[PDB]
Amino acid sequence: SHLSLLYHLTAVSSPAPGTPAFWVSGWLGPQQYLSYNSLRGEAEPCGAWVWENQVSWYWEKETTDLRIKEKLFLEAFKALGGKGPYTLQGLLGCELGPDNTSVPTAKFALNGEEFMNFDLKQGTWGGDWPEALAISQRWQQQDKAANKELTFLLFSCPHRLREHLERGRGNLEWKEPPSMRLKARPSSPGFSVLTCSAFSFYPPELQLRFLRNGLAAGTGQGDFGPNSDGSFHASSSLTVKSGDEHHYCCIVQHAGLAQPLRVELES
């Protein structure tokens, strides 16, 4: 629907040596625009956002806010004792909505399971485990922390999101259609596998389907992943009887194409 700005925060209690105890990636929809870790200690732009037509002090404000969150996350481990090791994750951010309105997100997970949130109307951290209470009180007892979290989600995030939409519009409206290949290989005896592959496309939404005689033959089994520049790869595979490979074609739908593209077997 609406594109959002979300921060993926992680802290670990026993980091491998020379790896960060705390690190952040910032995402504008499916694009990473921000990177931060506790060894380097500054927030920095990623990819094409290095070149964004940005205002002075934008990035030093990002650095300032994440340093506060760094300390908070590490303090959370002190409030636990237990034994560990622990992993603490947070998903913090906002999404633009209707009447020029912002919808915030503030969720946390411990060793891979969601256990706590921030209530934005009340300004409190809450959850049900003993660990949520321990961490939430330690954070609650921290002078100004709840206020800074309120400002971060209710003010800074939507202002950041609206700025990047204007100033990063070239990046957000980037369009790159997939390069397509259709290949077959033998599989079980009497069977071949047909693989329809989509290389280097943006945005990530894409559909692959197989046709035979112009009618649906099936979607096949799919997978999906990123390239290093934030474009994407996808493929889908269909099992067919040996000798039938040439009866099937692949059809791809993507915002980067003027219309669905039909793709034929290669020899």
Binding site: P85, N111, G112, S179, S200, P226, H233, S235
Partner: protein, 100 residues
């Protein structure tokens, strides 16, 4: 909780023998975040590899993109090898030349 990595291997552009390209190893859906990934050329570890930032999905599981510049040829086999607390031994996935 613990989650075992999924491993995919694929090229950035459609592969053509003798043409410079990039090879990806995308490891996803795992927890905790400590993980070891090597890209291999004919079984030997490639030194000149880079990776994206370790990040994570809505279900809180981690993912990580490793990649290396390469020039595929008919003879060469490339693979990705991953170890993780959830695995008794390293898991090797071979580049399938975009034909699973």
């Amino acid at each position: 909780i613990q989650r075992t990595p999924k491993i995919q291997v694929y090229s950035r552009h459609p592969a053509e023998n003798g043409k410079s390209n990039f090879l990806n190893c995308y490891v996803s859906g795992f927890h905790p975040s400590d993980i070891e990934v090597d890209l291999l050329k004919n079984g030997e570890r490639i030194e000149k590899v880079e990776h994206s930032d370790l990040s994570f999905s809505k279900d809180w599981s981690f993912y990580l993109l490793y990649y290396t510049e390469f020039t595929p040829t008919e003879k060469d086999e490339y693979a990705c090898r991953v170890n993780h607390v959830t695995l008794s031994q390293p898991k090797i996935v071979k580049w399938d030349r975009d034909m699973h």
